[PDB]
């Protein structure tokens, strides 16, 4: 698995977008971890060797939470916010992390350094773990694990669609899992609903799904938040939506540009009548949604506030004292 | 992980129950797979070496289905039914298994043979798998995996509680995940709701949870089905419940004993007013529920039909042409 030599790993792109520029560098072919690696049970290992116990409850009962942070031009973006959220999410599940927040950040940054990646996607998961015996059933006997991997930056949406916009679909075959079953404000791997939404998107010929909650209000997408703009007011679902760190940044940007930015309940009518709609997530940043169910949003092209937010997001990735943590390569 | 020598593996018990008797045998200490093993990517390996790629979507997005069958006195129980259900469940998720049903059965039975276990818990999972690169996001590019493990038979409920009964609790902090988010009739590892129910059981001082569905009707428990008996009529939830193979057996037994046995919607009032209530699952068999929320069911002791079903279930584990498949040790 994952047998590609350092020369075969794709870690940069020509984006065609003046505000997204990768670093100009070469991976060291003598470094077996160059271009991607994992931290598992104290070892830094290449992806081909990155394996977890099949008896980990993170697999057997998806008894796990996680976060993904990214690195851009050699700086982790909002790492403190990410690890704070991860630990809050662990606490929500009554998982007691075996490492402190500072220990987690230390290891994660060292992992990225070993990969040499200047632009990276970095997953940190914390599982209920496993017990002294492989068939243990008592949930209270398992000892928790932290697993990390760092791989090239991943794009949920292609560069041309960051420019031109994405054609969204309101999923009707699923609803976002209710908080009364699985809390969507705790980041998790239980994607059964989200994957059905992606499958429906394919079935109906659209590009990305937007799910609704049990009350029929706008929720979120398959690994991303949605933001709706109307008369200069920027809103995003507060209930059935992960509290995204990209979303947080987007609303901060909106306010700095002079717009009211709030979490709120958004109806389907309000989504369709919006001036602008956008999506956001760590794995891809920010992009426009120019139609919903084949109905254009406004004039069917990316709106001015969206474009300002996208540009500003990418500016903050290159120059920001408070938001950037340098990797010590 | 899982460093116990063959002599330290616990693979038999004195049950104190005349109808449950383990085999009388010794594991071969010269066999590294004796007492437990896994089949992963074509290799039979001891539990200490049983590891899956961290990039498997079965972990990263719980994009996986499974079944657990058991072996008793050297015979797999309802193996054909189990693998049929597993493959139906894979199809529901649009996962195309990389092996046929016959190939899966062949490997599973060989795995059990290598462990030497005459009484075993055997998990077979089928994941969306992983792609040529570790950070691939396209769900359609992953190549699916089959993972198996065989370990000593696991008991959800202790022997004394099979005899004396279990004290159940109706969960109110969660509802079973709705079919419109995650289908509970497809066996899955997305246990967020079920685990919250177990946590609530602990919080409120009971022994096992019974969840309700979105309509407030009886659903199922944390890895087990519930069955309610009233005036000689045996009923079990048809909607928010896995179609259990133990349940199937229980209803077959009920009919052979002359009782009407059906899947149905069961109200909370009907649960509390039942003559008898029982639980059932592959990992433990069948047991009585003698109270719900501290209210006795009937006279608070296991009922006659329940006891007849438990005894008959365990009889069918030892003598049954149609239901038993011998392991070739
Ligand atoms: C990760 C995630 C998001 C976005 O969160 P960020 O912190 O911006 O990456 C949105 N929705 C879901 C379901 C997610 O898992
Ligand atoms: C496995 C399972 C059952 C029981 O099914 P069997 O086929 O009898 O083992 C019941 N409920 C849930 C949620 C399960 O995962």
Numbering used by the authors:
A (entry chain A), B (entry chain A): 2 to 330
Provide excerpts from the study.
ATAs transfer an amino group of a chiral amine compound to a ketone compound using the cofactor pyridoxal 5’-phosphate (PLP) with a high turnover rate, stable catalytic activity, broad substrate specificity and excellent stereoselectivity, which is achieved by a proposed large-binding pocket (L pocket) and small-binding pocket (S pocket) in the substrate-binding site8910111213141516. The substrate-binding site can be divided into two parts as described initially, the L pocket and the S pocket, which is consistent with the previously proposed mechanism for the substrate specificity of ATAs in which the smaller and larger atomic groups of substrates are recognized by the S and L pockets, respectively.
The first R-ATA, which was identified from Arthrobacter sp. KNK168 (FERM-BP-5228) (Ab-R-ATA) by enrichment screening, showed activity on primary amine and methyl ketones or small cyclic ketones. In this study, we used Ab-R-ATA instead of ATA-117, the parental enzyme of ATA-117-Rd11, and could elucidate a reasonable molecular mechanism underlying the engineering of ATA-117-Rd11 because the difference between Ab-R-ATA and ATA-117 is only the amino acid residue at position 306 (Val and Ile in Ab-R-ATA and ATA-117, respectively) far from the active site, which is supposed to have negligibly small effect on the substrate recognition and activity and is not conserved in R-ATAs. The models complexed with a glycerol molecule at the active site of Ab-R-ATA suggested that Arg138 of the wild-type Ab-R-ATA is important for the recognition of probable native substrates, such as pyruvate. The kcat/Km values for pyruvate of the R138A and the R138Q mutants, using (R)-1-phenylethylamine as the amino donor, were about 350-fold and 500-fold lower than that of the wild-type Ab-R-ATA, respectively, indicating that the side chain of Arg138 is important for the recognition of pyruvate. Although the corresponding arginine residue is not conserved in Ab-R-ATA, the guanidinium group of Arg138 of Ab-R-ATA was located near the position where the guanidinium groups of those arginine residues in the other R-ATAs.
